Design a binder for this molecule. Structure first.
Ligand SMILES: NC(=O)c1ccc[n+]([C@@H]2O[C@H](COP(=O)([O-])OP(=O)(O)OC[C@H]3O[C@@H](n4cnc5c(N)ncnc54)[C@H](OP(=O)(O)O)[C@@H]3O)[C@@H](O)[C@H]2O)c1
Ligand SMILES: COc1ccc2c(C(=S)N(C)CC(=O)O)cccc2c1C(F)(F)F
Length: 315
């Protein structure tokens, strides 16, 4: 309704601001506007290369006494080059310093795929194929657990793990803490109800990323279906006197999923928060669900031959 609750007890705000593709020079004002409207959850990642500028906006708000740290849910993610057990605490610490924080509320393994460690975030080989490393995410998970032990993060989770990969963690001998969250792509064209159902039966909250199907993604070829311009969802939105964006954000909320839409435009950030005031009647919910095309915006074919590439599995 307003926040879901993690198995730790922690209240996770159901709406958050996304920061991927939000440019360094715009994301500080975007984060400030968002906290001024009442957003209390920011979704970040080291690979978005803007955590420093996110941090600046947070800092201004925290020292300006506009929010208490306890009222903020800040998420970041461990990038693929940092999956070797020994690189994890370093990567978490760099993210804390950039964000100008003492702890994270949630730290996610960003993708199940470990890439060759080094300065370059996407180490490529001759064939333009990404270079794997010598690690298994169950080892990365152990290092992610030590972050909880030390108080650097309040909960750990995963992102883009298929249900068999989540199982690998859950069935790990010696497991201290289990995935509190699994953040995955969920929108009308990829409604994901089997992975959602699986996660929920395991007690793992789901965060639906790319609610509007990422119009601004780099690889957006012009003959790709725009959820925002899909006349069908414009129609259901018209009935609602709301926008396609607003009903596209309402949809995950209603399915009891955390939503993190991205915008750097102030007006749009304010629009995206104007959604806790209407409900979609079950017909609409089911029509939105019937748009399931299994169309996946974040497919990342360049990674497909990786041993832990998540999407060759049904769910
Ligand atoms: N864990 C992962 O692997 C992963 C992967 C992808 C995304 N995510 C997270 O999910 C967040 C959201 O997904 P996304 O950024 O991929 O895409 P998205 O939220 O589906 O789409 C963002 C695009 O839609 C626009 N938009 C936002 N509000 C709008 C509105 N009210 N009206 C019209 N258009 C609007 C934004 O415009 P402007 O910004 O130009 O205003 C931007 O161009 C990301 O920022 C990231 O934090 C996580
Ligand atoms: C695991 O492989 C990934 C993961 C993420 C990306 C991204 C990113 S940062 N996203 C799709 C957003 C995100 O992962 O949060 C962009 C380009 C290539 C990627 C790749 C890849 F390079 F292979 F295509």
């Amino acid at each position: 309704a307003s926040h879901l609750v993690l198995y730790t007890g922690a209240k996770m705000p159901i709406l958050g601001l996304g920061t991927w593709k939000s440019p360094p020079g715009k994301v500080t004002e975007a984060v400030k506007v968002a906290i001024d409207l009442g957003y209390r959850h920011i979704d970040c990642a080291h690979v978005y290369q803007n955590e420093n500028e996110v941090g600046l906006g947070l800092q201004e708000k925290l020292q300006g006494q506009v929010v208490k740290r306890e009222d903020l849910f800040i998420v970041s993610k461990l990038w693929c080059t940092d999956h070797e057990k020994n690189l994890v605490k370093g990567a978490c610490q760099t993210t804390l310093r950039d964000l100008k924080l003492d702890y994270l509320d949630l730290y996610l393994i960003h993708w199940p795929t470990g890439f060759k460690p080094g300065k370059d975030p996407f180490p490529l080989d001759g064939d333009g194929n990404v270079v794997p490393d010598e690690s298994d995410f169950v080892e990365t998970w152990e290092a992610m657990e030590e972050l909880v032990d030390e108080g650097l993060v309040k909960a750990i989770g995963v992102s883009n793990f298929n249900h068999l990969q989540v199982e690998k963690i859950l069935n790990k001998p010696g497991l201290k803490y289990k995935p509190a969250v699994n953040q995955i792509e969920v929108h009308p064209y990829l409604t994901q109800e089997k992975l959602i159902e699986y996660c929920k039966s395991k007690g793992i909250v789901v965060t639906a990323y790319s609610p509007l199907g990422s119009p601004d993604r780099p690889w957006a070829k012009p003959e790709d279906p725009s959820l925002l311009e899909d006349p069908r969802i414009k129609a259901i939105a018209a009935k609602y006197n709301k926008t396609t964006a607003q009903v596209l954000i309402r949809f995950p909320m209603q399915r009891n999923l955390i939503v993190i839409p991205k915008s750097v435009t102030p007006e749009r950030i304010a629009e995206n928060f104007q959604v806790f005031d209407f409900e979609l009647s079950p017909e609409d919910m089911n029509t939105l669900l019937s748009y399931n095309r299994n169309w996946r915006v974040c497919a990342l074919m360049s990674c497909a031959s990786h041993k832990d590439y998540p999407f060759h599995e049904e769910y």
